[PDB]
Design an enzyme around this catalytic site. Sequence first.
Site, PDB file in Angstrom:
ATOM      1  N   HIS B  47       0.641  -1.132   0.072  1.00 48.24           N
ATOM      2  CA  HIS B  47       0.010  -0.129   0.023  1.00 48.24           C
ATOM      3  C   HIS B  47       0.841   1.093   0.146  1.00 48.24           C
ATOM      4  O   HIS B  47       0.182   2.199  -0.530  1.00 48.24           O
ATOM      5  CB  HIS B  47      -1.228  -0.074   1.257  1.00 48.24           C
ATOM      6  CG  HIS B  47      -1.934  -1.216   1.158  1.00 48.24           C
ATOM      7  ND1 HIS B  47      -3.005  -1.210   0.176  1.00 48.24           N
ATOM      8  CD2 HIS B  47      -2.032  -2.321   1.829  1.00 48.24           C
ATOM      9  CE1 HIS B  47      -3.810  -2.306   0.307  1.00 48.24           C
ATOM     10  NE2 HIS B  47      -3.027  -3.009   1.400  1.00 48.24           N
ATOM     11  N   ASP B  76      -0.325  -8.194   0.217  1.00 46.02           N
ATOM     12  CA  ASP B  76      -0.078  -7.165   1.332  1.00 46.02           C
ATOM     13  C   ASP B  76       1.363  -6.841   1.160  1.00 46.02           C
ATOM     14  O   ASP B  76       1.587  -5.455   1.723  1.00 46.02           O
ATOM     15  CB  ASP B  76      -0.434  -7.652   2.733  1.00 46.02           C
ATOM     16  CG  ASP B  76      -2.070  -7.692   2.738  1.00 46.02           C
ATOM     17  OD1 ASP B  76      -2.122  -8.916   3.453  1.00 46.02           O
ATOM     18  OD2 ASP B  76      -2.660  -7.118   2.290  1.00 46.02           O
ATOM     19  N   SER B 155       4.585   0.989   8.801  1.00 41.98           N
ATOM     20  CA  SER B 155       4.087  -0.201   7.872  1.00 41.98           C
ATOM     21  C   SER B 155       5.113  -0.496   7.089  1.00 41.98           C
ATOM     22  O   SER B 155       6.048   0.379   6.431  1.00 41.98           O
ATOM     23  CB  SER B 155       2.806   0.386   7.145  1.00 41.98           C
ATOM     24  OG  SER B 155       3.416   1.100   5.961  1.00 41.98           O
TER      25      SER B 155
END
Lengths: 197, 198
Positions: B47, B76, B155
Amino acid sequence: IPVASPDPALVNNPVVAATEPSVVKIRSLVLEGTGFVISPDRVMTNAHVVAGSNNVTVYAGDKPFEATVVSYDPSVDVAILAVPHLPPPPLVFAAEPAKTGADVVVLGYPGGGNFTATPARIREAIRLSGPDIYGDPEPVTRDVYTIRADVEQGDSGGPLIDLNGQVLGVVFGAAIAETGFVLTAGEVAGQLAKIGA
Amino acid sequence: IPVASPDPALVNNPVVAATEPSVVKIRSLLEGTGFVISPDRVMTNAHVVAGSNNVTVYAGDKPFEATVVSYDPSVDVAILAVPHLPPPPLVFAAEPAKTGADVVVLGYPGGGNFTATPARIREAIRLSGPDIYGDPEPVTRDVYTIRADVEQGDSGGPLIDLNGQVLGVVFGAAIDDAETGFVLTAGEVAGQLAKIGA
């Protein structure tokens, strides 16, 4: 929330024939879904059906119409298509929340086949929350109805209607339980503002 | 499940200093963290870099041009190619972490400086969501829940154990539960990569 099984006779309720012409099949890129007329020549559908496509067709009563994405954002579940020369009239959103146990109908195109009305019942209005997935577009929190119904991916972008023929929300998913998830009218309102619709 | 507060002393564990050079800041045209998994290859959060044509990796507080070379909307994690990247690969841990274990989140909160965030394993769980129609991402994922002061900048960063080996990839936080992060397990990451032939 346990509610009684949906009323099977809803398939023959006069509201279905009255609403059907304004509920359209969407084919993109091939991704398939449902949409509905929200104002003249404008169709709302699920953003995931049309995402990134410059090649969208809307089908109203067995005839193709070229569609153009005019409102879209990856952070938003709904998208708006411009559809020149689209005959059917807009559907109107219901002003107030559906009530627990209410008879309602999902309208759409399961399996990319013909139009089908799916009998449903309101279980509950809830705040559907997920984990904050870092950088993930999807909203973290949504106001939804849980409905007792057997929804299918082909119904995605289709309206949940009340028996007056007004739109309570938009079908967007299902529990991993005979339970569908529907964005509430208020949820849709907020999302529409985000995309400038 | 509840576990003890993380050990503040973890910030000073030598294994942080030893692994730090291999943990990199990512900027893409979004900001996040990544880590070296083999020479000139950096794993990060899909992302952070999704569809991006301009990705910079920072290793010595020095910029390096990076490119997304393994990616799919259904997965992911992403892999970045980074020519002439000096630091060595971090190694994934062969064994799973147990409840209560001392662990460390390595990354770049706020797109700022490198920080080691002390953490503790709560549990390895299956994280399940609704079937969101047309959403290509996994409906279920094997994760660790951890106790930690995570931040979105972390992240793509590694969760390391006391051997300085990678247990998983930091990928989210709880909204209702304070100081709770989600980390994709090593097995989850391997499984997703295999699905897209990476």
